[PDB]
Amino acid sequence: HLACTAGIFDPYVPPEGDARMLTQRTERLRKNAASQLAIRKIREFDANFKTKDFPEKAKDIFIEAHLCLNNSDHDRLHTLVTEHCFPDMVWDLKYKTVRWGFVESLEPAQVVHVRCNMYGQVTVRLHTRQTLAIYDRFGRLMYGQEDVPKDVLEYVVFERHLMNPYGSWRMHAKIVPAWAPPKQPILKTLMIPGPQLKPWEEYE
C-alpha cells in the first residue's frame, strides 16, 4: 500500500529574485490557468483548500517535523511527512544528537503551485532562520552552530491522498532553487583517495 508517490507531478520553476519579492500573489492569479483547475481538484474533496490560508497549516507541519528530530519523535514524524520524505530525514542522523530551533520567519509562507487515484501536491514557499548543531556519538560537535541563526529559503511540497477518506496533508519533498546558497561545510576533513591500481598497472 502506497499513500504517496515519489517525484513531483509538475515541477514549478522558481524565478531568481523571488526572495526580494501582492506582486508574486498576482503571478499565481495570472498562472491560475495552469493551477486553478488543479486547485479545484483539491477543493472538490476538501472545499476549504485556499492558497492564501494553506501555508499556515503546512508551516506547522514543517516546523513540527524538524522538532521531532530533536526529540527523535519518529512516530510523530511519520504522520507529519509522507513515506518518501521520512527515509531522507532520519537515516543519516543515526547515533547523532542534533539541536534544532526555529527563528522568526523572514517572510510569510505562500502557496506557489499545485498539481495533483488522486494525490494533491502543493508547492509552498518558505524563508525562515534556524539554528542547527549536530554532535558525534561521543558528544563532539561535527556540524552547525548551537546558537547562530542561518537564513534559508526553500520550497516545500506537501502531498495528500484525495481519494482516501483518511487522507491528510503530509510533507513529501522540498524543491531547492538553484539560486539558493550552498550548505555550510562540515567541521571534519575528508580525503579523496587516489586511483587504485594493480601491481602490474602504473600510476597515470
Add this chain to the structure above:
Amino acid sequence: SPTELTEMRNDLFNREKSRQLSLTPRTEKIEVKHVGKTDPGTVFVMNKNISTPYSCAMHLSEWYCSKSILALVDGQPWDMYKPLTKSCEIKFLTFKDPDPKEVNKAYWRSCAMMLGCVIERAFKDDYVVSLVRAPEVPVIAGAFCYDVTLDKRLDEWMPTKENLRSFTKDAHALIYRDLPFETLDVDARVALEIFQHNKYKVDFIEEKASQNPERIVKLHRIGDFIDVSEGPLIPRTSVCFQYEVSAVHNLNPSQPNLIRRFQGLSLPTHLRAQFTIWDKLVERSRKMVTED
C-alpha cells in the same frame, strides 16, 4: 635584565599569532593534491591557514610523519608545521632524498639558531652578550658557525674544554626537551621593535626586508628564544642525535667588541655516526671556517 627582554619578546610573538589567527575567519576548505612520488594524486580538503603538512602525514600513516622533515608546496619548500594557505600541490621531503642540499641547509640553519640560544643563556645574567648573525657556510666546511659579540669585560675570557662540554650539555638538554620550532613571518617594523636593543640584529632584519618587495621577515622562536632565519628550519629540536661544540674562534679585528665565531657539529637521529667517525668529524670541526 635579559629575562625582561624575553618576556616582552614572547608577548609580541603571542600577540602577532593572535592577530594572524583573528585575521582568518572560519575554516576555509582548500583542495591540496599530493604530488609526492609515493601515493601520488591524493587530494585532502584542509582548513586554510590552520592545517599544516604534519596533519596530512597523520592522515596517511605514521611513517610519513617521522620521515617527513619538509614539504614542497607548489614546488616551494614549506615547513612541516607551517599552516597551509591555499589549494596547491604538496610533496614531502625526507633526510634520504637524492638531493638533500635543500634539506641540509634547513638543518644547518636550525642548528645555528639553536647554538645562538645556548650562548645567550649559557652566561650569567650579569654578563651582556649580543648576537650579531649566523654565518652561512657549506656543509662541506665541516661545522656550522654562529657569530656573537661579547662585552669588554670578557675580552680576556676564553672557554676551556670543560666549558665547551657544558655548552653541549645545555644544547643536549634542549634536544631532550624537544621544543617544536615556531614560525612567524613578521614585518620589519614589528621585527625592528622586537630586536631594537641588538643593533646587529636590526641590520639583518633590514637586509631580509630589502630583498623581498614587502617588509615581511622570517622569524623563528624556540620557546622563549627568538631569532631570524635565512630559510626553513627543522620542525623540532629532537631531530638532532649527536651534538658538540667543537671550538670557538675570535675574529682578529674585534676592537669595538669581541666577535667570536663558534664551531659546532650536529647529526640527526635518522643519520647516526660511529664513535670513531664522530671523533674525527669533531676534530675536523675545530678548524676556523671562513666564508667563500
Add this chain to the structure above:
Amino acid sequence: ISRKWEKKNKIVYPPQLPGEPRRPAEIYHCRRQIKYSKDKMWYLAKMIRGMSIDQALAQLEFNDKKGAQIIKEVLLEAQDMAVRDHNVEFRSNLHIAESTSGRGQCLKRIRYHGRGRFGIMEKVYCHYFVKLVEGPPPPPEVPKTAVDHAKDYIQQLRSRTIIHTL
C-alpha cells in the same frame, strides 16, 4: 553465547557540554568464531598490547603465525569502521588499548587409532577481543631511580603509626 563486545560499539554518549574536553574515540572489535586456539592467540595479543596501530600492523606483516594474519585482518576492519563511522580524521592516530582472546564453541569427535585405541578429538574455536583508542600509545613507564626509592622509604617510615599503645 554472549555478544556484549558489539554492544560496546553501540553505546551513545550524551552530548558534550561546552565545558568538556573533546572525548577520545574508543572502538571495540572482535571476531567471534576463529578456528584457532585462544591460548596460542593470547601470546600474540599480549605482545601487541599498548602498541601503536602502525607498529602492530608492521610486526604482523612479518609474523610467521597464522593467528597474526587474522589479528591484522581484525585490526584493519576495526580501523575502517573507525574512520567510516567514528569520525576518525587521521588513520595513523590509533593505538592498541586492549587485546585479548576468549574461548569459542568447539566440536567433539572420536580419534581412532590403528591398534583399537581411541581418543577425544576436539575442533577448537576461539573469540578475539580488541579495543582501539584514538591517539598515540601512552608513553612507557619510567622505572623508579634510587633517589625516588629512598625518599619513599623515609616517607613510609614517617607514615608509620605506633601499634598497641596508649
Add this chain to the structure above:
Amino acid sequence: AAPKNRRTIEVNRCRRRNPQKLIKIKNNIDICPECGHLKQKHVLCGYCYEKVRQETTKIRQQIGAQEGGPFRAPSVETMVLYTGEKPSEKDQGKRIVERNIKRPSWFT
C-alpha cells in the same frame, strides 16, 4: 607416570607469561622505496618483485612458444626485444624474443 596433582592456573599462567615464552618485537622492519611497502633490511621488496616474476613468465611464455619443442635450447646467445625497439648489428647471431608490450621502465 601421571601428574600427582592438578597444576594451578596461577602456576601455569606464570610459565606461559614468562618473558622467555612471550613473542618478541622486531626492529628490522624497513620500507621499500620502489613500491613504498614494508620490507626487512635483509629481505627484498615483493610488490615490485611481483611485476618482475610475472614479467619473467610472460617472457618465458613467449620463449616457449618460439622454441616449440623440448630439448631445443639454442647454442647461441638470446636477447629480448620489446615493441618499438629494432634489432641492431650487435644483435645479429643471437636468439631474439619479441614482446608485444613496450620496454618496461625498470627493465633496461
Add this chain to the structure above:
Amino acid sequence: ISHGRVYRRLGLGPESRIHLLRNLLTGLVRHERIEATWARADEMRGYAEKLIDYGKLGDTNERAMRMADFWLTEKDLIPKLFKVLAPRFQGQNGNYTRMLQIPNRKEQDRAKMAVIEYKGNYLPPLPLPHRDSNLTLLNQLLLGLQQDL
C-alpha cells in the same frame, strides 16, 4: 655438531645430493634464474661457478665434455655452455653467479628462499640494492674531510 663441516646434507643421500644438485644445475642453465631454498642455493653456487670454468677450458677438452654430459641431463644444453655461457664469461674471472635473499615462502613451512642467477644474462635485472649517494649530509661531511686531506 656442525664444526668444520664443509658439505651440506641434502636429499636422501650423497648420491641424491649430487642428483638434486645436478637437477638444480641443469634447471639453472636452461633458465639462467632459479628460486630455491637458501641452504640449497648456497651449496650449489660453488658448483655453478666451477662449471663456467669448465666451459672456459674449451670444447675439445675430454674432461669438460664428460663433466658437461654428467651434470647436464638435457643434452641440448651442452652446446649452449660452450657457445653461450663460456663466451659470455670470458672477460669475467669469477663471480659468475649472483645469489640474493627472497622473502620466505608463505606455504606454512616458512622456508628461507633465495634466487640464484647467472650474471650477464638477458633476463630482466633483479631489484638489487642501491648504496646511498655521496650527496647525503654524512657523505658530504666526509667529502669535506677528503678535500682537506
